[PDB]
């Protein structure tokens, strides 16, 4: 009976519509969740493989074996590492090399390569850095003295996945067994000794485990893990997944309007069909029953097909970009799932709540002639209501984030912004006169029905202020990183460098053939007083640590000047805005510093921006030329090359005072992972704007479905197909220029509350986003609506369609 | 009469305040007969500390100078003979200016190796002996067996070392 | 005895300007097998008198009964209740669901009833080929003339098998033939069941076959014929 | 002189067992100010008919020519273009927009035609109120009776100011006095402005006032009165 019923239905034109937009908007939220929750994954898995570990125990000496054995006991694998420094001897050459020692554990994850490659840590034999090998001129093969004993070596390492992305490890890297430690002699009391303890395994046992020991931790040991480290890489690690779940959030809230929509639709369209039903007295329950039925068929329906497309789209993505993606990720949860159902649900329940009993109370008749309908809950009561309601589910969701608050404050202020320009518009079009025939028509289409023109103005704002919040915060993050690592970037640094040593190193290097940046001089002084007033007694670190304070010449490149003036003159000082934030330091203000026991005041006269993920040198203060010439002064350079590395060991015998320091592999690393989340994010913002530019098609198809009859009438009375390409052109590009407008100030709000309280980053206003803004999202509209007009129009006989 | 103190962190304070130091500790427990004033800095090499010296011999101008250098210079490894050079060139500047140095026994901790530090250890007694100076011992092993007298790098000793070491230091 | 009753029956649509006046005070005495036909010009509230006749809206005020109940004290659940089991309507523009055949159409009261499907299938079936509609039986109302259409409500009212029967407009769009057809079919029905019946068309004729007539002028009904 | 003109005209609908036969051959000639009415029983095509007469639809085989222009060979925007210049069309169902006014309604076609929103409202404030539908220009189709829709369609066909004019049903939910009112008027129309009219209606009284009656039976038109 009813079977038929719903398979005449489904071939329906507005059942067709309503039913493809909620599979598409399933498909595309389930397969966007799955992406973003693999990505994440394989993000984690990744700085897993980079710390070689999943948690990380560091102590100062040796802790008990108890809890080792209820780590096996539990099932976690446990592995050891020492880490100290000796002073080994090629020939009667004296080095220091920094030792490292392992088991056959290591290398718990990611990957070890030594040369030739291959070679791991084995009893008989070390390894060398390649630096440490020219400077001692060994090779592979030769037997050296470590420590106190005489090992073979057995070759050099490329790269150890564990070294610490530490700028200061001056110290070249030794390797050798854990068996051989003892050999050597070193273990002793009072010894500097790190013992490092990487832990693995299955999260829930790691918690057990962490539990367990949470009552048993000692201030020698450092237990932790990755995400909470303050680490640049930490910190840019936390917003690409804040990254993830904004794009999420978006996607999820533009198939809330897109449903919504529809569901709307739906139930105007269903009033024919509830009144006639009412009209022949049938009983409540059983129209009841009736109308869920097909309601909750069709949504069963939608969720199938979604499901299935999405399936298989993620499929076909992860075919297509795997040779872009690094690596197979591992499979992902099926929280997406239950995200994508429970909100189509929910929202097309509270969509069609009202209408229903407000059908079952008002009479048929009513309904029929559009009488007053009974004065039961208002739409001023209803959507408050629905706002609270959807709050607090997407608080439960996401556990309540900064960025919920930021997205709604700024969905909030866009509907106010539309609701006070729509009634502005609406006066300023009634008292507008026109000449053109299209622009009339759209004035009068527009003018006729104005709720219907809000409820598309809202929509198609929101969608154009997510997409534009999104595209922006991409380029931003791209722009930033970018910026903080300079392709060009020196791979090799030196300090320790004399006044009198530089003009011998500058000779060096430009036999070599290098070009030098900034030798920056360094004064090592400490601000031991703030407008007269001692810092001792504060925990700041900045004025308990020691200082290293600089002058330069040329205006810094990385840090412009937010607040003052460059450059500063005598006894001023540039100061940066964080340090004088929490130093409670504002512009004028007297720092004095203590240096070599020689104390001197500055005043601070410039404001600047210092991003200390930049692997340029940064200071918390600049002074002009000859403001501490008297002090003595160190030297720091920096330069880039990868020609052989007999030069290396040619400096460091003419200049064994200076340090030299090297950082390729860390430099590579973090490329790669640059690389790595900079593809993640570009995928993630193109199907993202996919998917979008799909939502906004079906929204427009909405919009002409609800047309059609008017569309229809005027072409049966002889209306140019071109007259009505022309008229929707101007009615969409009207709709989307006003659309772009407020979602224009919208996003504006949006990204100034996101980048103040989330992403930590200064606001800026663009000018640009409000001018492409709505002209670009009228144009797509123009165009969408132009195409659908097109396809519609074709055909022969249409006013025998009027009714449907 | 002033004691002028020229070292490295051990004496300068690691991440500490001036007053947070030993020797600061040591000039209050010291304010009414002989001051003590601190000129450590550090991260110095032997060649710094040269380039430091004039500097400070020419502001404080004491009677005796205590010189606790080249240990940040053996812990980074330098080859004994510059450093010997280095060190005998700053003692002789130090004692031709009319200031008494004060030469601290160093011995590198037994895991940087035991030629090495043997090698360096050597080279204090015979500085002492050939500038007739007295050589305080390696008080670092006093904190070699205290964990609660460190820190979590195990280089520096914490707050609650210095005033240990401003004691170990009155007495010696 | 008496099956409707009417007493001070008003009805007006809008507000302020807007509000319009249609009834001015309806007093009306219709007994069972009655047949009362109601004439007037177009625009002059015969239909929405009819529908509010029926119980399916509520006037400005008055007293209504149908059957001996106060249609005005029960609620909407209790009005269906009473349609489903006595009342029939005919509407104007036959308020046809599109996505179903006639045949479908017809035979869903006797479904919303309870009936079995074989039962209501043979019962909907000997309806349209007794008004000729056997060879449009999957035909759809879009397919179908607007004559098609009035006949299908017709079958499908028929098919109710009400006590008391509203139509408006029973065949205004049907030729003499068809016209008198389904008059005649009407006719059979209230003398055969005792269906009360109220039509509501512009057919002289057929009004005056009517026991009563009424005309209704200035909101009010006047007795005719 | 022959405005319209018809040759071998034939219509079928459905397909296998669905299909149906409409016409068998329809000769049609009709010069300028002819009044043509047609007759028949309901499903017998006289809708679809008169609809492919007015060049909407294409039948299964035949010739249609309409002001001396072969409809088929022509596109869909060469008829568009004739109807907006010379054709105007009304409906069974009045086919009009649930979202726009009567008055807004008839001034449609005005506007589509170019002219300025003044001289477009009050012709169409005059086709409304000479309609007696003044009172009721803010009122929506859904707020209106079917009268007043048919009306409202009449006074739209009228603001199109056509040179052939097709009308299936024009009176037929209308009383006597209206629907004579209607009669007068087109009759009025056509005489002064040479206006073709061609009208399907049951009503014998206006179709004998035509020029020319023809009765479609068996797909075929048999010339009567
Ligand atoms: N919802 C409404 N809003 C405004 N006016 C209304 C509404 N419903 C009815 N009216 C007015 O009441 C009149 C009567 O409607 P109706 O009962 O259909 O007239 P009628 O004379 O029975 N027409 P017919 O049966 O077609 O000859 C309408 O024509 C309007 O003038
Ligand atoms: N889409 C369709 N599918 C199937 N049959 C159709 C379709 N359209 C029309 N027909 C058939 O063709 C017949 C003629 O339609 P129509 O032209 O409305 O008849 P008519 O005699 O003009 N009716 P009326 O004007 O109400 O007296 C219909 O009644 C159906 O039998
Ligand atoms: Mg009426
Ligand atoms: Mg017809």
């Given at each position: 009976m009813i079977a038929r019923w719903f398979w005449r239905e489904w071939r329906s034109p507005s059942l067709l519509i309503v039913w493809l937009a909620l599979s598409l908007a399933v498909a595309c939220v389930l397969a966007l969740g799955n992406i973003s929750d693999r990505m994440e994954k394989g993000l984690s898995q990744q700085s897993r493989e980079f710390m070689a570990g999943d948690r990380a125990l560091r102590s100062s000496r040796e802790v008990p074996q108890a809890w080792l054995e209820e780590a096996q006991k539990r099932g976690l694998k446990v592995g050891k590492q020492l880490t100290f420094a000796t002073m080994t001897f090629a020939g009667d050459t004296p080095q220091l090399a920094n030792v490292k020692a392992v088991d056959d554990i290591y290398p718990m994850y990611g990957d070890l390569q030594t040369?030739?490659?291959?070679?791991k840590p084995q009893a008989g034999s070390v390894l060398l850095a390649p630096r440490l090998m020219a400077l001692l001129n060994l090779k592979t093969g030769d037997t050296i003295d470590v420590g106190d004993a005489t090992l073979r070596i057995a070759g050099e390492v490329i790269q150890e996945p564990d070294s610490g992305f530490n700028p200061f490890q001056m110290a070249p890297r030794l390797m050798m067994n854990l068996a051989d430690v003892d050999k050597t002699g070193a273990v002793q009391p009072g010894s500097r000794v790190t013992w490092r303890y990487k832990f693995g395994g299955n999260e829930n046992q790691l918690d057990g485990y962490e539990k367990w020991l949470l009552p048993q931790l000692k201030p020698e040991q450092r237990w932790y893990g990755l995400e909470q480290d303050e680490g640049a890489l930490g910190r840019s690690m936390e917003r690409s997944q804040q990254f993830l779940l904004l794009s999420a959030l978006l996607t999820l809230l533009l198939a809330v309007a897109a449903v919504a929509v529809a569901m709307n639709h739906y139930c105007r369209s269903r009033y024919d069909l509830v009144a006639i039903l009412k009209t022949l007295g049938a009983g409540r329950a059983q129209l009841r029953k009736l109308i869920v039925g097909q309601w909750l068929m069709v949504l069963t329906l939608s969720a199938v097909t979604g499901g299935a497309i999405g399936l298989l789209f993620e499929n076909v993505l992860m075919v297509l970009l795997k040779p872009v993606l690094p690596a197979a990720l591992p499979p992902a949860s099926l929280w997406p799932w239950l995200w994508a159902l429970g909100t189509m649900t929910v929202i097309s329940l509270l969509v069609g709540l009202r209408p229903y009993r407000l059908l079952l109370a008002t009479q048929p008749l009513r309904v029929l002639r559009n009488d007053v309908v009974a004065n039961v809950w208002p739409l001023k009561f209803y959507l408050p209501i629905v706002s609270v309601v959807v709050v607090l589910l997407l608080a439960g969701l996401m556990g309540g984030s900064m960025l919920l608050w930021a997205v709604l404050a700024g969905a909030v202020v866009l509907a106010l912004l539309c609701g006070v320009l729509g009634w502005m518009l609406l006066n300023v079009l009634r008292r507008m006169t026109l000449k053109s025939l299209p622009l009339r028509l759209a004035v009068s289409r527009l003018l006729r029905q104005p709720w219907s023109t809000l409820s598309q103005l809202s929509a198609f704002s929101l969608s154009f202020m997510l997409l534009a919040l999104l595209l922006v915060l991409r380029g931003d993050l791209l722009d930033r990183w970018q910026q903080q690592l300079p392709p060009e970037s020196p791979n090799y640094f030196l300090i320790n460098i004399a006044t009198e040593q530089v003009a011998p190193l500058k000779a060096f290097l430009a036999e070599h053939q290098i070009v030098p940046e900034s030798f920056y001089p360094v004064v090592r002084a400490r601000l031991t007083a703030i407008n007269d007033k001692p810092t001792e007694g504060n925990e700041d670190e900045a004025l308990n640590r020691e200082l290293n304070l600089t002058w330069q010449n040329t205006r810094p490149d990385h840090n412009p000047i937010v607040?003052?003036?460059?450059?500063?003159?005598?006894?001023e000082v540039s100061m940066e805005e964080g340090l004088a934030k929490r130093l409670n330091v504002a512009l004028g203000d007297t720092v004095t510093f203590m240096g070599d026991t020689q104390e001197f005041r500055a005043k601070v006269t410039s404001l600047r921006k210092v991003d200390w993920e930049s692997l340029r040198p940064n200071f918390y203060f600049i002074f002009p030329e000859g403001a501490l010439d008297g002090q003595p002064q160190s030297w720091l350079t920096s330069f880039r090359w990868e020609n052989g590395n007999g030069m290396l060991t040619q400096l460091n015998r003419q200049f064994p005072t200076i340090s030299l320091l090297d950082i390729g592999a860390i430099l590579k690393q973090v490329g790669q992972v640059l690389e790595q989340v900079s593809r993640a994010l570009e995928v993630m913002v193109v199907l993202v704007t996919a998917c979008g530019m799909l939502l906004l098609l079906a929204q427009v198809q909405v919009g002409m479905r609800q047309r059609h009859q008017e569309l229809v009438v005027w072409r049966t009375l002889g209306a140019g197909k071109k007259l009505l390409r022309t008229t929707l052109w101007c009615e969409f590009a009207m709709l989307g220029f006003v659309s772009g407008l407020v979602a224009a100030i919208g996003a504006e709000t949006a990204l100034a509350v996101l980048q103040a309280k989330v992403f930590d980053f200064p606001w800026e206003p663009d000018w640009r986003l409000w001018i492409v803004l709505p002209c670009s999202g009228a144009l797509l509209l123009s165009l969408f609506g132009g195409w659908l007009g097109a396809r519609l129009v074709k055909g022969k006989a249409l006013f025998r369609q009027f009714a449907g | 009469d002033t004691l002028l103190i020229l070292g490295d962190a051990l004496s300068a304070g690691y991440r500490m305040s001036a007053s947070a130091a030993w020797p600061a500790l040591l000039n209050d427990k010291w304010q009414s007969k002989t001051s003590v004033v601190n000129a450590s800095i550090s991260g110095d090499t032997s060649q710094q500390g040269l380039a430091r010296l004039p500097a400070l011999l020419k502001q404080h101008q004491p009677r005796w100078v205590l010189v606790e250098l080249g240990g940040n210079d053996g812990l980074r490894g330098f080859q004994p003979q510059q450093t010997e050079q280095t060190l005998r060139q700053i003692l002789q500047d130090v004692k031709a200016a009319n200031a008494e140095p004060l030469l601290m026994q160093i011995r590198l901790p037994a895991n940087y190796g035991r030629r090495y530090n043997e090698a360096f250890s050597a080279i204090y007694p015979k500085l002492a002996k050939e500038f007739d100076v007295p050589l305080l011992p390696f008080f670092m092993e006093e904190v070699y067996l205290k964990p609660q007298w460190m820190q979590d790098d195990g280089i520096h000793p914490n707050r609650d070392a210095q005033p240990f070491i401003a004691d170990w230091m009155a007495k010696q | 005895e008496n099956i409707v009753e009417v007493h001070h029956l008003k009805k007006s649509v809008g507000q302020g300007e807007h509000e319009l006046s249609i009834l001015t005070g309806v007093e009306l005495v219709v007994k069972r097998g009655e047949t009362i036909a109601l004439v007037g010009e177009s625009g002059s509230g015969k239909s929405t008198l009819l529908a509010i006749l029926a119980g399916l809206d509520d006037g400005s005020s008055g007293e209504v009964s149908l059957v001996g109940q106060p249609l005005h004290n029960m609620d909407e659940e209790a009005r269906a209740k009473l349609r489903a089991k006595h009342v029939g309507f005919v509407f104007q523009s036959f308020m046809l669901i599109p996505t179903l055949n006639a045949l479908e159409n017809v035979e869903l009261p006797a479904l919303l009833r309870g009936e079995s499907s074989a039962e209501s299938r043979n019962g909907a079936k000997a309806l349209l080929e007794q008004l000729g509609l056997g060879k449009r039986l999957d035909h759809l109302p879009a397919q179908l003339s607007g004559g098609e259409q009035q006949r299908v409500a017709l079958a499908r009212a028929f098919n109710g098998r009400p006590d008391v029967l509203f139509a408006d407009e029973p065949t205004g769009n049907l030729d003499r033939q068809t016209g008198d057809k389904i008059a005649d079919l009407l006719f059979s029905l209230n003398r055969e069941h005792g269906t009360t019946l109220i039509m509501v068309t512009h057919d002289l004729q057929l009004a005056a076959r009517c026991d009563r007539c009424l005309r209704l002028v200035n909101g009010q009904l006047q007795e005719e014929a």
């Open positions: 040369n030739p490659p291959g070679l607040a003052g003036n460059w450059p500063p003159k005598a006894d | - | -």
